[PDB]
Fold this protein.
Amino acid sequence: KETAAAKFERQHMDSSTSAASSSNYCNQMMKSRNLTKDRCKPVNTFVHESLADVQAVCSQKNVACKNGQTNCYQSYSTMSITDCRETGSSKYPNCAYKTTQANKHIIVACEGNPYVPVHFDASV
């Protein structure tokens, strides 16, 4: 089955664009990454950076995750991100999202050898 690292890439990485190009970015990406297939995922963030730059966060500033786990890390630098969260009209299978551009630090949880992101915790 899909690894946690691979799931993180599918859910949260978008190295192919520098930022969201339109208000339909989230609608399209949430669909394309299969985050709407079974149910409308309520909120999601995409990171517009190289994979290696995001994986490198696992050796940056340790911080406890929201859930208290101690394998979370905050990026030293801000990153281009897109916040996706459901609109009031979103109704499965017609999932619908508000796209918001931002430049924020990210917080990810890391696991494994290589030690890589497995969960997107927050934009801060």
Observations:
- The chain is about 20% helix and 35% strand.
- The beta strands are 43-47, 61-63, 72-74, 79-86, 97-104, 106-111, 116-123.
- The CA atoms of residues 41 and 65 lie 20 Å apart.
